Enzyme design. Structure first.
Site, PDB file in Angstrom:
ATOM      1  N   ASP A  48       4.628  -7.738  13.521  1.00 38.75           N
ATOM      2  CA  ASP A  48       3.943  -7.148  12.374  1.00 38.75           C
ATOM      3  C   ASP A  48       2.538  -6.732  12.812  1.00 38.75           C
ATOM      4  O   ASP A  48       1.782  -7.544  13.341  1.00 38.75           O
ATOM      5  CB  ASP A  48       3.855  -8.174  11.242  1.00 38.75           C
ATOM      6  CG  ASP A  48       3.465  -7.557   9.910  1.00 38.75           C
ATOM      7  OD1 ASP A  48       2.456  -6.834   9.841  1.00 38.75           O
ATOM      8  OD2 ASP A  48       4.168  -7.811   8.916  1.00 38.75           O
ATOM      9  N   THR A  62       0.800  -1.221   0.000  1.00 32.32           N
ATOM     10  CA  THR A  62       0.000   0.000   0.000  1.00 32.32           C
ATOM     11  C   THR A  62       0.842   1.284   0.000  1.00 32.32           C
ATOM     12  O   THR A  62       1.917   1.332   0.600  1.00 32.32           O
ATOM     13  CB  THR A  62      -0.967   0.017   1.206  1.00 32.32           C
ATOM     14  OG1 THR A  62      -1.569  -1.276   1.355  1.00 32.32           O
ATOM     15  CG2 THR A  62      -2.063   1.052   1.001  1.00 32.32           C
ATOM     16  N   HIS A  67       7.178  -5.202   9.351  1.00 26.46           N
ATOM     17  CA  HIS A  67       6.342  -5.441   8.186  1.00 26.46           C
ATOM     18  C   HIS A  67       7.092  -5.122   6.893  1.00 26.46           C
ATOM     19  O   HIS A  67       6.839  -5.726   5.852  1.00 26.46           O
ATOM     20  CB  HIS A  67       5.079  -4.578   8.292  1.00 26.46           C
ATOM     21  CG  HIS A  67       4.110  -4.766   7.167  1.00 26.46           C
ATOM     22  ND1 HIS A  67       3.322  -5.889   7.039  1.00 26.46           N
ATOM     23  CD2 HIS A  67       3.782  -3.959   6.131  1.00 26.46           C
ATOM     24  CE1 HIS A  67       2.550  -5.767   5.977  1.00 26.46           C
ATOM     25  NE2 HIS A  67       2.808  -4.604   5.408  1.00 26.46           N
ATOM     26  N   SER A  72       2.601  -7.361   1.342  1.00 23.55           N
ATOM     27  CA  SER A  72       1.545  -6.676   2.086  1.00 23.55           C
ATOM     28  C   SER A  72       0.198  -6.790   1.354  1.00 23.55           C
ATOM     29  O   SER A  72      -0.343  -7.892   1.235  1.00 23.55           O
ATOM     30  CB  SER A  72       1.939  -5.218   2.336  1.00 23.55           C
ATOM     31  OG  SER A  72       1.063  -4.596   3.258  1.00 23.55           O
ATOM     32  N   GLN A  73      -0.340  -5.675   0.856  1.00 20.51           N
ATOM     33  CA  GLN A  73      -1.609  -5.726   0.134  1.00 20.51           C
ATOM     34  C   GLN A  73      -1.432  -6.568  -1.132  1.00 20.51           C
ATOM     35  O   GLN A  73      -2.374  -7.213  -1.598  1.00 20.51           O
ATOM     36  CB  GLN A  73      -2.107  -4.328  -0.236  1.00 20.51           C
ATOM     37  CG  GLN A  73      -3.531  -4.346  -0.795  1.00 20.51           C
ATOM     38  CD  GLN A  73      -3.987  -3.019  -1.370  1.00 20.51           C
ATOM     39  OE1 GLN A  73      -4.742  -2.990  -2.340  1.00 20.51           O
ATOM     40  NE2 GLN A  73      -3.546  -1.918  -0.773  1.00 20.51           N
TER      41      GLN A  73
END
Ligand SMILES: *[C@@H]1O[C@H](CO)[C@@H](O)[C@H](O)[C@H]1NC(C)=O
Length: 207
Positions: free
Chosen positions: A175, A13, A187, A90-91
């Site tokens: 995280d 993101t 993260h 992540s995303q």
């Protein structure tokens, strides 16, 4: 001619269009294997930030999941004999998780459980690396890391991904997204911490 191996990378993101932190593992595969090409998934990768267009996280995941499925399916149709590798951060890991495993993503507005990838595409995918996947939950067979809880979009406890044997999902205790931690830095460091392990897995998965 079609590549021997092709890697799809999805960023985290707020990062501008590109590979983002998925670049680490993507580059490792490219350098280690002759005839390896790659592409980044074109999607919002946003969470309401004005920097990335103001697109909400839910709308970003909705677009992303479809974008990921369409990119993988379309490429497989062009190059059916090419071995596919997915690398999401992540995303980016979340959209690949939804596209490969299906099972829906209720927290982001996705109710359909069917795997959006074609049968041919699924069999072509040899390995999938997820880093900081918000869909994480302790207990999944493909988990690697110190996290023993879950992420904000946690998968069902005891979820069964049809392609569970082709995945490696890295997530540590500190995280705050893929786990219940409070250290955002953790993260962002999976590429350095598990990069070589990821490559080793991809190498064992590849024919
Ligand atoms: C998804 O977002 C990208 C930009 O990130 C855009 O080009 C594309 O048209 C969107 N796809 C859909 C199905 O809305």
């Amino acid at each position: 001619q079609c590549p021997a191996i092709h890697v799809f990378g999805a960023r985290e993101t707020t990062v501008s269009q590109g590979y983002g932190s998925s670049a680490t593992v993507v580059n490792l595969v490219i350098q280690a294997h002759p005839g390896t090409t790659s592409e980044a998934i074109v999607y919002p990768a946003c969470g309401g930030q004005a920097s990335c267009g103001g697109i909400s996280y839910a709308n970003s995941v909705v677009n992303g999941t479809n974008a990921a499925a369409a990119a993988i399916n379309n490429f497989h149709n062009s190059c059916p004999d090419t071995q596919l590798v997915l690398v999401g951060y992540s995303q980016g890991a979340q959209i690949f998780d939804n596209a490969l495993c299906g099972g829906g993503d209720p927290g982001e507005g996705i109710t359909n459980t069917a795997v959006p990838l074609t049968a041919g595409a699924v069999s072509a995918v040899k390995a999938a690396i997820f880093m900081g996947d918000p869909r994480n939950i302790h207990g999944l067979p493909y988990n690697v890391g110190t996290c023993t809880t879950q992420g904000f979009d946690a998968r069902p406890a005891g979820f069964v991904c049809p392609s569970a044997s082709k995945i490696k999902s890295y997530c540590d205790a500190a995280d705050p997204y893929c786990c219940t931690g409070n250290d955002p830095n953790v993260h962002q460091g999976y590429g350095q911490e598990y990069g070589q392990q990821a490559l080793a897995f991809i190498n064992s998965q590849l024919s």
